[PDB]
Design a protein around this ligand. Structure first.
Ligand SMILES: OC[C@H]1O[C@@H](O[C@H]2[C@H](O)[C@@H](O)[C@@H](O)O[C@@H]2CO)[C@H](O)[C@@H](O)[C@H]1O
Ligand SMILES: OC[C@H]1O[C@@H](O[C@H]2[C@H](O)[C@@H](O)[C@@H](O)O[C@@H]2CO)[C@H](O)[C@@H](O)[C@H]1O
Ligand code: CA
Ligand code: CA
Ligand code: MN
Ligand code: MN
Lengths: 239, 239
């Protein structure tokens, strides 16, 4: 059985097990800031940042025809300090081609180049979208399962607890091909769940990079924070 | 689209919207005790209790072939006061034939007569099993999805936060036929998730009773508490 597994109770500058891209930064206090925060403490607009695990993970194998089961957990907080305009854009957990660089920002969240449904993206993501683009449902924020497109195949509205930490658990069972994600707000006790069928074998390449990406709006002050406090990942490829 | 929906922030004695069977009792303080508790505050062994919603719900319809989507949420606490013998047996959220009476106790949790997988049982349950019977995996407690049998088709171990309150969310999506359940322990922040594919129209009858059932062990002190503090349910049948 081939297994990959990492865990971060917190983050520390320089940890060579993490690849930072764009605005992604690790404060001295241990928190990972995906998008830029000005020195006055306010989140900056027109910002995009991502963090990947330095090592690719074997998600499935052609020869044997088997696919791995995985689980990831992380905590984050989104703070929307401005009244107007509307905050943007959200953050995502994603698995895609190895050696990837940041794509388009804003509504694309740093992982897509446009709103097309294109299988060549070979990307899977679970988004926490805070801005309603023309391809989004009217409700925001919302959890969404993204398969080769920013236009989610499944969506679940949730209420933001401004500035509070949320716990996320994303799990994939190769057996039934079910991807189930859950979001919890310890502060209010709120629990959100979402599940959909995803055939990883038809979406992702055999090896993929796993990471987190966040982005702020395309206009002045259409921004919010995208802070991550911890992150763990585990995958098991049978045989 | 016929919809059924109820919610109990707390329980009140006499409320004719709930059917109590076996040992099930509602205290003056508003908590629902599925299994018996002696006057000295200790849980009694050899006890079985169930609570059914007083009205059947329409889960699917032959005519149209449409099946409903539902969601249920409840809070409970299991307290295992004795060191030995091992505590038993657990509690279940279940849907089954209407006008039913409690079945066998102990490991059968009051909803099955034996461990046989039989379609005539027409019972679906999400269990929180605290005792490992011959048909159970070695780990307890565990969440299990029961389809016409006490021998779960899917199992997920979880760590009991003895005596503390747990929040449960069980959701079923007719579209994908996915049953996803999540258990959360506010006290420790633990989050457990489990999901499996279940085709409700090949398992349950058109109309069903929805309820909660709990049971304590077959020998002295093989007992624990099975208290429920709140419970809500909702189902939507298209057309
Ligand atoms: O306001 C936040 C959103 O901006 C959208 O882009 C807008 C832009 O803000 C506006 O000035 C003008 O250029 O129209 C654009 C729409 O194409 C982003 O697309 C959206 O993701 C948010 O960032
Ligand atoms: O001890 C709790 C478990 O008891 C099991 O039944 C036992 C019984 O306790 C023992 O005295 C003897 O009769 O063997 C039985 C096994 O068949 C229950 O089956 C189990 O559910 C627990 O309640
Ligand atoms: Ca969006
Ligand atoms: Ca058992
Ligand atoms: Mn979206
Ligand atoms: Mn069991």
């Amino acid at each position: 059985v081939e297994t990959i597994s990492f865990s971060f109770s917190e983050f520390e500058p320089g940890n060579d097990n993490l690849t930072l891209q764009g605005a992604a930064l690790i404060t001295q206090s241990g928190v990972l800031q995906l998008t830029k925060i000005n020195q006055n403490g306010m989140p900056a607009w027109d910002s995009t940042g991502r963090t990947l695990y330095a090592k690719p993970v074997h998600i499935w194998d052609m020869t044997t025809g088997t696919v791995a089961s995985f689980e990831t957990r992380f905590s984050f907080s989104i703070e929307q300090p401005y009244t107007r305009p509307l905050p943007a854009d959200g953050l995502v957990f994603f698995m895609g081609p190895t050696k990837s660089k940041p794509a388009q920002g804003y509504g694309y969240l740093g992982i897509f180049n446009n709103s097309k449904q294109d299988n060549s993206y070979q990307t899977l993501g679970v988004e926490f979208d805070t801005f309603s683009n023309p391809w989004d449902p009217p409700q925001v924020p919302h959890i969404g399962i993204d398969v080769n497109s920013i236009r989610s195949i499944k969506t679940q509205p949730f209420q933001l607890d401004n500035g509070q930490v949320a716990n996320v658990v994303i799990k994939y069972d190769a057996s039934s091909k079910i991807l189930h994600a859950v979001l919890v707000y310890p502060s209010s006790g709120a629990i959100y769940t979402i599940a959909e069928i995803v055939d990883v074998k038809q979406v992702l390449p055999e090896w993929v990079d796993v990471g987190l990406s966040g982005a702020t709006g395309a206009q002045r002050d259409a921004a919010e924070t995208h802070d991550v406090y911890s992150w763990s990942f585990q995958a098991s490829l049978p045989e």
